[PDB]
């Protein structure tokens, strides 16, 4: 996941001074100015709270998949530390398989379990 | 060089940087709001020469192919300019093809007659030895029609009464937002068309000699209006390519400077490193 | 010795203009490489044309020169080299060319340069 | 010690948004200084408008400058000084003229001398 | 007096930088740029030439509260010595007002005096 990362932060990188007149429809707007926001949302980090990286791991595959293309900026941060209970709560299995083969699980699973969370989140 | 010149000179040049970084991107919106105003006019200017390519085959009117409005020593040029600068040659150009071509066809100032949109063309035409009829000091960055409609039918009106001999429309298209050409046109006395009629009522109730004189006017201020369009996106195009040529001469300035710097102080620091040197060994 | 009590205010207002030119045209060069010709004033435009002829005036062509160039070279008296120079401020020789004003003794040699050039 | 923790929420937020808008009037100077403020959209009409009232109302008088400019100084406690920012922040003097908040010291203060200029 | 000069010429010095820019330039910029090129013309001193401050202070109010905005540029210099001739046969109370005082003078007196001045000075 940490090469379609690089890829959407560092093209951020280069379009971030261009946002004085957002245009050019995807070859700005929806995509580069868009993921590349929620990207710099999603790395930042409050003090002395590291954090698993199995936990770290889901996060940035939900960024990078596309998951969060519908929330909007301001509330990335408050989606990502209900994801993180929503986790502990309930993907106990995905967590553990993560951890003891160092792999992403199926997708199909892990599809359906950030879909399963996104039902219940509120966007306020 | 001093030190102290060469950081100012950095310094001012990366202002002049900012300031024409900051005028690029204004540029760039401007000509993306200005497309869209020209596609808006097209479709107006489609229907109005499908209308017309086939009803102005007929008789004599106010400004059929008739080349007799007074063929006399007045024929006017509209010329188009920007109002403010740093657009490279885009006015120098169009004004030159004016000033040749009038100075050329022209023997007298009588036969001099012109009219310019745009504060640079006033200030040149002012400078040399022209007659100005109207003008408009400034108009919006994305016109509409109400903005120069009242200047268009006074170019008509002109036009009537053999005021005006024939009208030549002098401006700048763009083929994209790197290239603009200069054109010349022959609009009201209305040279040629093409025959494609399929029309027998559709807004006939007036005569061929009763709609023409009215319907005509309106035909050459959606002309002048769409010319007017065009050359605000070429305008606004040179703009855009002035600041960014202007952003990195400034920035291949900056690095050169930068570069004579830092080669420049450290040979300052090995002196006062031999200084020290050789003050420790005469003890 | 450059003060209006031994050289006299014509002497002085000339120098002190031609000093003034040339400043500003030294100023003027950084705008210019970064922005073009085009992009000044007529004011700025007009500067660079008179201070590029002052500077090219302002050279001589030395009799101990002969031996290094075939030009014999001249003597140029201060009431001419006074009067030349207000007249080039004045604007009297803008139609000439540049390089007309290069290695020459009076200002009368720089039109004799340009008509043999062919103006 | 600017920290939500140390400071206070309020305050915290107060002072970043303050510099927040202090940081982007700063870009926009250019561009006003060229072309006229109408070219900035509506949103950057009323961040200039209130970045210049912030501006001047970071001013204060002292005790100490008695003996150069007559005017008598003024102590300004936290809470207020919080309390008159998040004020001009959300706008509320946005109607008064921008010369009544220099050298002020509470925001009431400002009230009374934009009476004593004719508001 | 020097209050409002020192403003002038720091607001003068900002915008200067701008002046390379065009000549359309915001109407108010223009304005300061005048004023400021006439402060900077004001300023300018001959040699072996003082100065009694009964007439620098004149000479910098008369600039300051606006009097010497419609005389070009090129004729300040003769202008501030034709108004430093004149305030010897004319206007006398107002240097004898300031020499005393250290004070100036009434507003009304000091504004008659520069408009006579100014009906009879030539422009060229």
Chains 1, 5 share one sequence.
Not at chain 2, 77 to 96: E, F, H, K
Not at chain 2, 117 to 141: A, E
Not at chain 2, 146 to 170: C, N, Q, S
Not at chain 3, 54 to 81: C, D, M, R, W
């Amino acid at each position: 996941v940490a090469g379609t990362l690089r890829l959407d932060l560092a093209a951020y990188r280069e379009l971030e001074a261009f946002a004085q007149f957002g245009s050019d429809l995807d070859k700005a707007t929806q995509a580069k100015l868009a993921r590349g926001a929620r990207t710099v949302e999603v790395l930042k980090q409050d003090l002395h709270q590291p954090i698993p990286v199995e936990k770290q791991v889901l996060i940035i595959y939900a960024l990078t998949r596309g998951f969060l293309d519908d929330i909007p900026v301001e509330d990335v941060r408050r989606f990502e530390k209900e994801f993180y209970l929503f986790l502990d709560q309930n993907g106990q299995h995905l967590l553990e398989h993560i951890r003891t083969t160092k792999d992403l699980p199926n997708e199909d699973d892990l599809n359906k379990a950030i879909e399963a969370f996104k039902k219940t989140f509120v966007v306020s | 060089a001093s030190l102290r010149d060469i950081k100012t000179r950095i310094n001012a040049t990366k202002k002049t940087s900012q300031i024409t970084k900051a005028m690029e991107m204004v540029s760039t919106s401007k000509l993306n709001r200005a497309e869209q105003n020209a596609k808006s006019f097209v479709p107006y200017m489609e229907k109005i020469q499908e209308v017309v390519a086939n009803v102005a085959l007929g008789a004599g009117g106010a400004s059929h192919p008739m080349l007799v409005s007074r063929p006399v020593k007045k024929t006017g040029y509209l010329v188009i300019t920007s109002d403010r600068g740093l657009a490279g040659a885009y006015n120098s150009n169009v004004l030159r093809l004016v000033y040749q071509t009038i100075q050329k066809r022209h023997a007298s100032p009588d036969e001099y007659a012109i009219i310019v949109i745009g504060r640079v063309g006033l200030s040149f035409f002012r400078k040399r030895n022209m007659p100005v009829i109207l003008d408009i000091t400034r108009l919006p960055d994305q016109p509409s029609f109400a903005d120069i409609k009242e200047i268009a039918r006074k170019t008509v009106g002109l036009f009537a009464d053999g005021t005006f001999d024939e009208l030549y429309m002098y401006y700048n298209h763009y083929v994209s937002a790197i290239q603009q050409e200069v054109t010349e046109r022959k609009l009201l006395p209305l040279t040629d068309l093409a025959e494609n009629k399929q029309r027998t009522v559709y807004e006939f109730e007036p005569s061929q000699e009763e709609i023409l004189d009215v319907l005509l006017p309106q035909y050459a201020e959606s002309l002048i209006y769409g010319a007017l369009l065009d050359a605000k996106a070429s305008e606004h195009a040179a703009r855009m390519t002035a600041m960014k040529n202007a952003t990195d001469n400034a920035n291949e300035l900056i690095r050169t400077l930068t570069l004579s710097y830092n080669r420049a102080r450290q040979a300052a620091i090995t002196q006062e490193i031999t200084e020290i040197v050789a003050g420790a060994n005469a003890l | 010795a450059l003060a209006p009590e031994i050289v006299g205010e014509e002497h002085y207002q000339v120098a002190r203009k031609v000093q003034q030119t040339l400043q500003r045209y030294k100023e003027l060069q950084d705008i210019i490489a970064i922005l073009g010709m085009d992009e000044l004033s007529d004011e700025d435009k007009l500067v660079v044309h008179r201070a590029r002829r002052i500077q090219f005036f302002l050279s001589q062509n030395f009799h101990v020169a002969e031996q290094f160039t075939g030009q014999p070279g001249s003597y140029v008296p201060v009431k001419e080299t006074v009067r030349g120079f207000k007249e080039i401020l004045e604007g009297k020789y803008d139609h000439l060319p540049e390089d007309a004003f290069r290695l020459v003794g009076r200002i009368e040699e720089v039109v004799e340069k340009a008509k043999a050039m062919g103006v």
